[PDB]
Structure formats: C-alpha cells, structure tokens
Amino acid sequence: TLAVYHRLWGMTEQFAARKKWGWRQVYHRMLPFQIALYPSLMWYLFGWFDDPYKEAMTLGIWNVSKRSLYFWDPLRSGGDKGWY
Amino acid sequence: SGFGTSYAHDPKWIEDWMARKRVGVDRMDWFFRAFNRLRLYELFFKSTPRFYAFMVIGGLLGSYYWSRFWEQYWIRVNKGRLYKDVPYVYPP
Numbered sequence: 001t002l003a004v005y006h007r008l009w010g011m012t013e014q015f016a017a018r019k020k021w022g023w024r025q026v027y028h029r030m031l032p033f034q035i036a037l038y039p040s041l042m043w044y045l046f047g048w049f050d051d052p053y054k055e056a057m058t059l060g061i062w063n064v065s066k067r068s069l070y071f072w073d074p075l076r077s078g079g080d081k082g083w084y
Numbered sequence: 085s086g087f088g089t090s091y092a093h094d095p096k097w098i099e100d101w102m103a104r105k106r107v108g109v110d111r112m113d114w115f116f117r118a119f120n121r122l123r124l125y126e127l128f129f130k131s132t133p134r135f136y137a138f139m140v141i142g143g144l145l146g147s148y149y150w151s152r153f154w155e156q157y158w159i160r161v162n163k164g165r166l167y168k169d170v171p172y173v174y175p176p
C-alpha cells in the first residue's frame with residue numbers, strides 16, 4: 001500500500017510546471033487582441049510620422065495628394081509649396 | 085370618429101390597418117439570406133477580438149474613404165470658385 005501512497009504523493013510533484021502552463025494558456029487566449037490594438041495605435045499616431053513614412057505605412061495609398069483640400073496648415077494645402 | 089371629444093375612437097380604416105398582421109410573411113428574407121453569404125459572422129463578429137478588429141480596422145478605412153468621398157463632392161459643387169481652381173494672374 002505504501003506504493004499506492006507514493007503514487008498519490010507524487011501526482012502533484014510538478015505543481016510549478018502545471019501552474020506555469022495554466023497561465024501560458026491564458027496568455028495564448030489573449031494574443032488575438034493584438035489584431036485590434038496595433039492598428040488602433042498607428043491610427044492615433046499616424047499624424048506623428050513623417051510624410052514618407054505615412055506613404056510607406058499605407059503601401060502608398062496615402063500620399064501628399066491625399067491631404068485635405070483645406071490642410072490644417074493652409075500654407076501647405078496642395079503641397080509643401082502650395083497649389084501654384 | 086369622435087375626434088376631439090370623450091367619444092373619440094379609432095376610425096374604421098385604422099381598425100382595418102391593425103387587422104393586417106402579415107402572419108407568416110417575410111418579404112425581406114432575401115436580404116438576410118444574401119448578407120449571410122458574406123460570412124462576416126463566422127469570420128469577424130463571433131469572436132470578440134476579431135469583433136474589435138472589425139470596428140477598429142473598419143473605422144480606419146471607413147473614415148478615410150468617407151472623407152475622400154465628400155472631399156470630391158465638395159470640389160464638384162464648388163467648381164470654379166475654389167482657390168485651386170482659379171490660378172491668380174499677377175498684375176503686369
């Protein structure tokens with residue numbers, strides 16, 4: 001019967017490894033939230049980057065020609081040197 | 085009839101209106117049937133993290149092209165009256 005007790009004692013020997021695995025599975029389930037976090041950050045920080053990085057970050061969809069007709073810096077509407 | 089008195093009661097045509105229950109009739113089922121084929125629910129809505137990503141990425145793209153569309157509308161309506169449309173001629 002001591003053998004049985006040995007098995008019952010030993011079935012929890014690896015508690016630290018099992019609790020680590022538990023938390024590793026909670027973190028695995030939280031990785032998908034990155035899909036929304038990262039684009040939201042770049043969405044809020046877009047105005048911080050320089051124009052050439054704005055263009056590259058959007059694969060060229062955004063460029064200087066895409067700035068609004070009334071740019072917040074009116075002297076730079078239509079380009080850095082103005083419309084004409 | 086009886087409008088404006090304590091005898092007011094629903095006219096006949098309102099009673100007939102409320103007698104039409106449209107039981108067992110669905111004239112808009114085609115819309116939902118075709119909408120479901122986009123698989124938006126299976127791909128995005130069902131999972132909360134993907135639901136958030138749809139709102140964020142959709143808002144990002146939607147906001148940009150919404151601005152783009154109405155900027156073109158503004159340029160068309162005000163054609164010939166914008167600063168860019170009328171290059172200035174310097175006096176000699």
Ligand SMILES: CCCCCCCCCCCCCCCCCC(=O)OC[C@H](COP(=O)([O-])OCC(O)COP(=O)([O-])OC[C@@H](COC(=O)CCCCCCCCCCCCCCCCC)OC(=O)CCCCCCCCCCCCCCCCC)OC(=O)CCCCCCCCCCCCCCCCC
Nearest residue numbers: 105106107108109110111112113114115116119122124142
């Ligand atoms: C991001 C993209 C993702 C991928 C692509 C996605 C593509 C899909 C996009 C889909 C977009 C939505 C389209 C509409 C879907 C159908 C309607 C719906 O929601 O169904 C749910 C549900 C369906 O009804 P149900 O009773 O459950 O149906 C049961 C059975 O299916 C059938 O039951 P039944 O057969 O027994 O019928 C019962 C019921 C069935 O219910 C209905 O069918 C009635 C409700 C239909 C609403 C339709 C909404 C359309 C959306 C507007 C789009 C605007 C485009 C503008 C373009 C501008 C571009 C810049 O009908 C009635 O109760 C009978 C009376 C109905 C009276 C309705 C009066 C509407 C008059 C419209 C006149 C328009 C004239 C325009 C002239 C313009 C000239 C230039 O309807 C609603 O809940 C909708 C009405 C809610 C109140 C409306 C709020 C009004 C205030 C806002 C005003 C501003 C509008 C802004 C529009 C924004 C658009 C984005």
Ligand SMILES: CCCCCCCCCCCCCCCCCC(=O)OC[C@H](COP(=O)([O-])OCC(O)COP(=O)([O-])OC[C@@H](COC(=O)CCCCCCCCCCCCCCCCC)OC(=O)CCCCCCCCCCCCCCCCC)OC(=O)CCCCCCCCCCCCCCCCC
Nearest residue numbers: 035118119121122123126127128134135137138139141142
């Ligand atoms: C009798 C009456 C009849 C009435 C008929 C009415 C017809 C209905 C009309 C509606 C349309 C019908 C279409 C029929 C298609 C038939 C063919 C077929 O079998 O379809 C395949 C299939 C149909 O599903 P199924 O065959 O029944 O399979 C069911 C499965 O559960 C689902 O399959 P699955 O998920 O296993 O595989 C789908 C797979 C198909 O694709 C693949 O398998 C490709 C996999 C990659 C292969 C390797 C490629 C390597 C190279 C890549 C190079 C390119 C890189 C760059 C790509 C950039 C892309 C942006 O991926 C996708 O389609 C997209 C999902 C990708 C993964 C999503 C999860 C990732 C995280 C997302 C985070 C959440 C937010 C995201 C952002 C949301 C937006 C803000 O998929 C679709 O048709 C669904 C399309 C999903 C895309 C979004 C659609 C929404 C946008 C609609 C716009 C509408 C505009 C309206 C304009 C109106 C003008 C007036």
Ligand SMILES: CCCCCCCCCCCCCCCCCC(=O)OC[C@H](COP(=O)([O-])OCC[N+](C)(C)C)OC(=O)CCCCCCCCCCCCCCCCC
Nearest residue numbers: 049050051052053054055056057058059060061062063064
């Ligand atoms: C199998 C598929 C592979 C997919 C990826 C590769 C193929 C993709 C499709 C083709 C495009 C290839 C890439 C081209 C990009 C060009 C961008 C460019 O030059 O833009 C111009 C801009 C501005 O350059 P410019 O100012 O000289 O002007 C460009 C010139 N004109 C104007 C004429 C267009 O440059 C950039 O923005 C350069 C960005 C480089 C970014 C490199 C990132 C590398 C990865 C970093 C990892 C960081 C995390 C580390 C983690 C550590 C571990 C935890």
Ligand SMILES: CCCCCCCCCCCCCCCCCC(=O)OC[C@H](COP(=O)([O-])OCC[N+](C)(C)C)OC(=O)CCCCCCCCCCCCCCCCC
Nearest residue numbers: 051052053054055056057058059060061062063064065066
């Ligand atoms: C393991 C192998 C993986 C690869 C497998 C093969 C398939 C994929 C291979 C792709 C390689 C080819 C990429 C071509 C890039 C051309 C860039 C260019 O000329 O930009 C000039 C543009 C414009 O240059 P500009 O700023 O000088 O503009 C001049 C404008 N005019 C003419 C009016 C004066 O530059 C940029 O926008 C800079 C950023 C570049 C964009 C980001 C990197 C490239 C992304 C490629 C995406 C490909 C997907 C399909 C297209 C998506 C868009 C609709």
Ligand SMILES: CCCCCCCC/C=C/CCCCCCCC(=O)OC[C@H](COP(=O)(O)OCCN)OC(=O)CCCCCCC/C=C/CCCCCCCC
Nearest residue numbers: 041043044045046047048049050051052053054072073076
């Ligand atoms: C759960 C708590 C959450 C708390 C969240 C707090 C609120 C966060 C608000 C997010 C704001 C995002 C940034 C907005 C920037 C706007 C950019 C813009 O419009 O640009 C204005 C204008 C544009 O000028 P241009 O001539 O085009 O040249 C600039 C360079 N290309 O100037 C700029 O872009 C400058 C922008 C500078 C941004 C600096 C960003 C880095 C700041 C670091 C913050 C670190 C915070 C750490 C907090 C730790 C707390 C424990």
